[PDB]
Amino acid sequence: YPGGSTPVSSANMM
Amino acid sequence: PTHADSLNNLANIKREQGNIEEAVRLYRKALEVFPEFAAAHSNLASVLQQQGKLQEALMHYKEAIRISPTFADAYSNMGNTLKEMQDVQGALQCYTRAIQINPAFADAHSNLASIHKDSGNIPEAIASYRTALKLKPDFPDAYCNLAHCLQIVCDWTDYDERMKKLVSIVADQLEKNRLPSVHPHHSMLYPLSHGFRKAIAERHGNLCLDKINVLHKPPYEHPKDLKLSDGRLRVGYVSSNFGNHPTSHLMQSIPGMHNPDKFEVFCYALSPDDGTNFRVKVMAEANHFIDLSQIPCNGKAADRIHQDGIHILVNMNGYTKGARNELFALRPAPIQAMWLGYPGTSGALFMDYIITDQETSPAEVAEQYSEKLAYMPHTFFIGDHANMFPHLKKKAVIDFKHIYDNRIVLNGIDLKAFLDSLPDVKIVKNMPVIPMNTIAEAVIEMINRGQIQITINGFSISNGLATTQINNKAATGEEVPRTIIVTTRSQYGLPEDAIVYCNFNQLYKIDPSTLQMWANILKRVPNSVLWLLRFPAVGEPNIQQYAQNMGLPQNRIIFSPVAPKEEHVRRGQLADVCLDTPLCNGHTTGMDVLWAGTPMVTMPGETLASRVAASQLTCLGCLELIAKNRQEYEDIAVKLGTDLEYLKKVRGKVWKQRISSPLFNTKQYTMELERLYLQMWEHYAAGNKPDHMIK
Numbered sequence: 159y160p161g162g163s164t165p166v167s168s169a170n171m172m
Numbered sequence: 173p174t175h176a177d178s179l180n181n182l183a184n185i186k187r188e189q190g191n192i193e194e195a196v197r198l199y200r201k202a203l204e205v206f207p208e209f210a211a212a213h214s215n216l217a218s219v220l221q222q223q224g225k226l227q228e229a230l231m232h233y234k235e236a237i238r239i240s241p242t243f244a245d246a247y248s249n250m251g252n253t254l255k256e257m258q259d260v261q262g263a264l265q266c267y268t269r270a271i272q273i274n275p276a277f278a279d280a281h282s283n284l285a286s287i288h289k290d291s292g293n294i295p296e297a298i299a300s301y302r303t304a305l306k307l308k309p310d311f312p313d314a315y316c317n318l319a320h321c322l323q324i325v326c327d328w329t330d331y332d333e334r335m336k337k338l339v340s341i342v343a344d345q346l347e348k349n350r351l352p353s354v355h356p357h358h359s360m361l362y363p364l365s366h367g368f369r370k371a372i373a374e375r376h377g378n379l380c381l382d383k384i385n386v387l388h389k390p391p392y393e394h395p396k397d398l399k400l401s402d403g404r405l406r407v408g409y410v411s412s413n414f415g416n417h418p419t420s421h422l423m424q425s426i427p428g429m430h431n432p433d434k435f436e437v438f439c440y441a442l443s444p445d446d447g448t449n450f451r452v453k454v455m456a457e458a459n460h461f462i463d464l465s466q467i468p469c470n471g472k473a474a475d476r477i478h479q480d481g482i483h484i485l486v487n488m489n490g491y492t493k494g495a496r497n498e499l500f501a502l503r504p505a506p507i508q509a510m511w512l513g514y515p516g517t518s519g520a521l522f523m524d525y526i527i528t529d530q531e532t533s534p535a536e537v538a539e540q541y542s543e544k545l546a547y548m549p550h551t552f553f554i555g556d557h558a559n560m561f562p563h564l565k566k567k568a569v570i571d572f573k574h575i576y577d578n579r580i581v582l583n584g585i586d587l588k589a590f591l592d593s594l595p596d597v598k599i600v601k602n603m604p605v606i607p608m609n610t611i612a613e614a615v616i617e618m619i620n621r622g623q624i625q626i627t628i629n630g631f632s633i634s635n636g637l638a639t640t641q642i643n644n645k646a647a648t649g650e651e652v653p654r655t656i657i658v659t660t661r662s663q664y665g666l667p668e669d670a671i672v673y674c675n676f677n678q679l680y681k682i683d684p685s686t687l688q689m690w691a692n693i694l695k696r697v698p699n700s701v702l703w704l705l706r707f708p709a710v711g712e713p714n715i716q717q718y719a720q721n722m723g724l725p726q727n728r729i730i731f732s733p734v735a736p737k738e739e740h741v742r743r744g745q746l747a748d749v750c751l752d753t754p755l756c757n758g759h760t761t762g763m764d765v766l767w768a769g770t771p772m773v774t775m776p777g778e779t780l781a782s783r784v785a786a787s788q789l790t791c792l793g794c795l796e797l798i799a800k801n802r803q804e805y806e807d808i809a810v811k812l813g814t815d816l817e818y819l820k821k822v823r824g825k826v827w828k829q830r831i832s833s834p835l836f837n838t839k840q841y842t843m844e845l846e847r848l849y850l851q852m853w854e855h856y857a858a859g860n861k862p863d864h865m866i867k
């Protein structure tokens with residue numbers, strides 16, 4: 159969120 | 173010089189044969205004969221980088237760029253190494269120098285684009301990907317990465333042709349036996365066949381096998397019974413998300429709810445301690461907590477898992493950020509299962525099971541998974557909402573005039589006591605209603621003035637827009653709020669006299685067909701708005717443009733910023749109906765909206781990720797909200813928005829069933845999860861290979 163962080167499910171690097 | 177040329181040739185030969193250490197030895201021998209050998213330094217650095225020796229690879233990259241100042245390829249690959257070492261600024265310098273040395277270097281522009289992408293700067297990533305493709309039109313990695321950028325911001329220019337080209341690229345790469353340029357986690361968003369999606373994942377699982385085969389470790393000896401564990405089954409949960417992340421927001425209570433007489437819980441953390449209460453709780457309630465982030469070697473970390481005697485190792489990452497699937501490729505445990513964190517198949521032979529359910533993964537689409545299906549009785553999905561947000565179990569409303577349940581809302585642990593201090597409180601049949609009086613005017617005044625909080629009869633009344641100023645740990649879900657919170661449609665600019673359809677997902681889950689469906693619903697329900705999030709904000713102008721092309725004025729769609737976790741869940745009470753994304757459903761997001769009591773309309777597809785919402789609703793007990801096709805989805809949504817008595821019934825049903833159904837019952841979930849574990853074990857202990865557990 160603006161001013162903080164909202165972690166989500168995201169892909170790993172390749 | 174000539175001898176060093178021959179030595180570098182032999183090292184390249186031994187490299188292709190897979191003898192990496194002989195290649196290293198011969199690269200070093202070439203450098204011994206001719207020290208100022210740029211190609212040898214660059215070859216050796218590439219080999220060291222593949223082994224994971226990033227610091228040592230950096231040494232030889234630095235030599236290569238000094239000897240050959242025009243060695244643009246070395247700067248680019250050096251930046252790749254710095255990116256993996258998490259030195260983003262250093263990697264940007266190397267990519268920038270590579271493009272300065274050779275402006276036609278397509279790979280360097282694409283690598284620079286990925287830095288912008290990872291940094292959040294999608295318009296800059298898109299610009300750099302298009303430059304790469306202008307320089308090299310046949311460039312799968314850049315084309316597929318550009319496609320995902322355009323997905324994130326809902327840029328659907330030439331969408332059908334784009335989707336056709338993505339399929340063609342994957343078909344060619346699978347045919348030519350190369351690693352697909354589409355990431356397995358993204359494959360759910362594209363109209364690939366189930367076979368292609370499984371094959372993409374299978375190719376990634378083979379990467380992990382290739383990385384662990386160089387360790388030349390033998391197969392582990394696995395326990396054959398439960399004697400050495402005193403009759404207890406040893407379950408190891410492996411996750412990079414023990415901390416502030418959706419994973420812990422779903423399952424942080426499950427380790428402490430396991431039965432210690434029959435289970436011994438090991439939590440293997442792939443990330444360092446982020447200091448949050450989510451990490452505190454899992455560390456305190458698991459029987460054992462092991463920080464594998466301190467053990468970078470996958471061989472030594474796998475030895476640790478095997479030493480603990482784990483019977484069932486649980487993969488909670490799949491192909492998501494922070495994963496170390498090399499641990500599972502080494503097979504330290506006799507049973508290894510996918511659970512909760514990754515909505516797709518691993519495609520890998522070292523994963524035995526995927527924990528799902530009949531609604532999410534019916535036996536008919538089992539060919540989509542490489543694992544054997546392992547059914548939970550209701551849904552495999554779970555959430556910690558009853559523990560994290562108990563203040564939303566009940567609510568009260570303020571009648572600012574019939575009676576609305578979602579215009580002005582109060583929630584709080586001490587709400588009942590506050591209500592008991594007020595006269596003329598009415599109970600609607602049960603929802604308490606505060607009449608329009610001096611108390612009610614003071615609340616509205618606080619909201620309009622942007623005030624943080626007030627006091628009424630000694631009770632703390634907080635503005636729901638200001639939780640990070642009152643208690644930041646309450647705003648993130650790390651603590652239960654200790655004040656009474658006000659949530660109102662005026663806080664977000666929502667109409668007081670219209671139906672509010674919401675969707676709080678990241679915008680990447682929307683596609684053209686979905687927005688057209690939503691536009692059809694808004695046209696049929698003239699007194700309604702669609703409520704979406706700036707997720708990211710740069711997707712907002714694209715959605716609005718497509719909505720305007722579909723015939724919807726700007727005032728039919730309302731955007732809100734992404735909110736802290738508790739405010740996100742709490743403000744879902746203001747909507748009438750959630751319209752779920754069929755391409756990839758709300759997963760964590762669907763649990764969030766249902767905990768607020770909001771009915772959710774879904775159209776399940778064929779992939780796991782497109783069926784999670786219907787499974788949640790089936791467990792909740794609302795079969796009437798599950799659509800078989802796009803027309804039924806529209807019809808259901810329009811009926812909820814126009815049959816106001818039906819809407820009240822369904823909202824009452826969701827409101828009650830989120831408590832009385834199994835959906836949010838973490839104790840029941842753990843016990844069913846334990847029943848499924850013992851089925852896996854007793855099947856293995858009897859000497860059988862994994863088979864479907866679907867009863």
Ligand SMILES: O=c1ccn([C@@H]2O[C@H](COP(=O)(O)OP(=O)(O)O)[C@@H](O)[C@H]2O)c(=O)[nH]1
Pocket residue numbers: 164165166167168417418421676677678705733734735736737738740757758759760761762764
């Ligand atoms: O305004 C918002 C919208 C969402 N979320 C959270 O952000 C995450 C969304 O991540 P993801 O897209 O991976 O959710 P999922 O696919 O599981 O539905 C979830 O934890 C939500 O609860 C939030 O905190 N504030």
Ligand SMILES: *[C@@H]1O[C@H](CO)[C@@H](O)[C@H](O)[C@H]1NC(C)=O
Pocket residue numbers: 166167168418419422512513514515756759760
């Ligand atoms: C996000 O993370 C949660 C919890 O790990 C998971 O259940 C969900 O499927 C993830 N979402 C996506 C789109 O991968």
